[PDB]
Amino acid sequence: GYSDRVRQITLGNSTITTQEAANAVVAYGEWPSYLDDKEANPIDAPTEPDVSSNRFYTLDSVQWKSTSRGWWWKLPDALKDMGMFGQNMYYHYLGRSGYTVHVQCNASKFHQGALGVFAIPEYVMACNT
């Protein structure tokens, strides 16, 4: 019954379903985690907002056309205005976060096309002068 194509993800008060997935990637084979005392740096007791901020935020959609060349976002920038995550981000000097990224694009059995979806550490880009 269970399938590589069918998945549910629940975080906080939010749930995603998909019926045509292709497994899931865990970047570098490592699930996110909290910061251990033996690797810690700032010494103040941290804020861990948990369900208020660790939940799915849906960005404005973009349109894929035959002429589209692609899209980029940065993180945590893309979520800076998102609910309590954004508030916790901006009220503090320091923050760390992992992510579940879920990219959604359905069509039909008669459409064709392929999107590469990449998560890039330190995605530094060229300037235009």
């Binding site: 005392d37 033996k38 810690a40 740096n41 700032p42 010494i43 103040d44 007791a45 941290p46």
Partner: protein, 51 residues
Amino acid sequence: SGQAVPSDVIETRHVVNYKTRSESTLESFFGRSACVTILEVENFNATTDAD
């Protein structure tokens, strides 16, 4: 002098400190060859007291 540390006046997490004061021991602070003077000498056929 004042003695209080952060745990006395704020809520703190546990942080293990592995860092050491190795480079501020007196031996480390003074462990350098420092120039203390510049002397001059010459070699030539001297025909006066000054030379």
